[PDB]
């Protein structure tokens, strides 16, 4: 294969060639470059048709109605829109919000802004395996609790939350439930016609779509409402104003179409490679799996390596393009209870559509002799 080997699909993925060649047809003069807001001519009407096709492809993946799909600039905005939008709309019912310590920054920082605006937020600590204890969640809920935000798949450790149960808990108490599904979309099955989720965020560049585009699911029945954060013409049915980037939208739709198609087979292959990689390193003396092997995403493997200096670990695996989630170490691992040194020598392996058996075996061997020769030079390992 080629070097370095890309094992950072969770940071972003390459745009699928099929997705890319679709986008190319909605940019230049002899393409559908029109503005989907120009109602007086066909350049705009045809651009709107492409937008609608992509809107339905996105909806079909998550089992929603196209009218529930609101286009954003990405998952960051979607998380901001959902949380701030619901928090502001339902503040007359209360101002208390519940979330998790291991949520993506888009969620955590949004909640922090809301605290500065008078809202009260509870950040729940997860279990050692990353799972939220639903009884601790229940104990946090109150009369004035209006909103809960807990992600489907964790982007660092890949742990899967029980969003169905959480939805049941929320709906029963009239609490709005938001789910950040940026990592789960196109990986774990999602059906909003069954799920009791009110708001759900997803992106494009995590499932081989382009960066700079995303969407927000807003439940139509029972009707959920939000206050727009982006003003200027009341586009997206009053929920997100601005020109619709057709080429981006088309790319995201096409990506969601392909996902629905190759989902079952691809995720089998992924967790197959995922188990192949863990089996190949699990017998190294002092390594630790962060998350859950049996109910984690099929594409993420977060492993901690003991008695090795973190800085040098990332250099020893120079042949791999991975992530440590880091001067300061991952706030997610810190939340799990990892001491700062252990968190620094933790590697997040994320697999994808181009990952092969060959690359995994090469990775397994690289890890074996890297950890071995690092612990040789390690005064740290000598004391162990």
């Amino acid at each position: 294969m080629k070097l370095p080997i890309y094992l950072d699909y969770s940071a972003t993925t390459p745009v699928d060639p099929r997705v890319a060649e679709k986008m190319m047809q909605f940019m230049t003069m002899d393409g559908t470059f029109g503005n989907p807001a120009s109602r007086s001519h066909r350049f705009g009407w045809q651009a709107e048709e492409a937008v609608d096709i992509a809107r339905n492809q996105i909806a079909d993946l998550v089992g929603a109605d196209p009218r529930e799909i609101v286009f954003t600039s990405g998952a960051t905005e979607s998380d901001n829109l959902a949380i701030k939008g619901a928090a502001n709309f339902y503040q007359k019912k209360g101002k208390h919000i519940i979330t998790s310590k291991t949520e993506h920054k888009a969620v955590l920082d949004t909640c922090r802004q809301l605290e500065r605006e008078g809202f009260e937020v509870t950040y729940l600590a997860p279990q050692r395996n990353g799972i939220i204890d639903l009884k601790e969640l229940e104990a946090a809920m109150r009369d004035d609790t209006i909103l809960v935000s807990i992600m489907h798949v964790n982007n660092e450790i890949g742990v899967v939350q029980d969003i169905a149960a959480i939805g049941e808990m929320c709906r029963a108490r009239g609490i709005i439930y938001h789910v950040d599904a940026t990592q789960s979309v196109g990986k774990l099955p999602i059906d909003l016609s069954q799920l009791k989720v009110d708001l759900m965020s997803f992106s494009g560049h995590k499932i081989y779509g382009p960066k700079g585009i995303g969407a927000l699911y807003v439940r139509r029945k029972p009707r959920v409402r939000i206050e727009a954060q982006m003003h200027g013409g009341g586009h997206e049915r009053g929920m997100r104003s601005g020109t619709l980037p057709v080429h981006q939208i088309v790319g995201m739709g096409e990506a969601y179409r392909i996902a629905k198609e190759e989902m079952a087979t691809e995720m089998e292959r992924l967790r197959g490679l995922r188990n192949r990689l863990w089996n190949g390193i699990k017998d190294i003396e002092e390594v630790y799996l962060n998350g859950d092997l049996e109910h984690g995403a099929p594409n993420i493997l977060n492993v901690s390596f003991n008695y090795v200096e973190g800085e040098s670990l990332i250099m020893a695996l120079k042949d791999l393009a991975v992530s440590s989630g880091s001067l300061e170490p991952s706030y997610v691992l810190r939340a799990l209870g990892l001491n700062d040194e252990l968190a620094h020598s933790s590697i997040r392996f994320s697999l994808g559509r181009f990952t092969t058996e060959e690359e995994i075996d090469y990775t397994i061997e690289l890890v074996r002799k890297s950890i071995g020769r690092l612990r040789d030079l390690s005064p740290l390992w000598e004391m162990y």
Binding site: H41, R42, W45, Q46, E49, D52, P66, R237
Partner: protein, 77 residues
């Protein structure tokens, strides 16, 4: 003239841009030549639906806009 529609679409209660959104999706899952009865009460549809026909190469068979609810017979081009 509204007697033999192949498909029907209850768009009552829907407001722009929803009516046309539902029309786009329904017309896409239709065979070329089939007909769709569209029932709406969004005043904007008196402009939007014939516009959908003009700019999207479809045929507007018959409309009813002199009272509520409105009625539009569309034939997929």
């Amino acid at each position: 003239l509204f007697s033999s529609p192949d498909h029907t679409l209850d768009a009552l209660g829907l407001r722009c841009p929803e009516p046309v959104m539902m029309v786009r999706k329904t017309v896409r899952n239709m065979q070329p030549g089939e007909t769709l009865l569209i029932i709406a009460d969004d005043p904007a549809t008196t402009r939007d639906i014939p516009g959908f026909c003009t700019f999207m190469e479809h045929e507007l068979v018959a409309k009813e806009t002199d009272g509520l609810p409105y009625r539009y017979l569309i034939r997929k081009g």
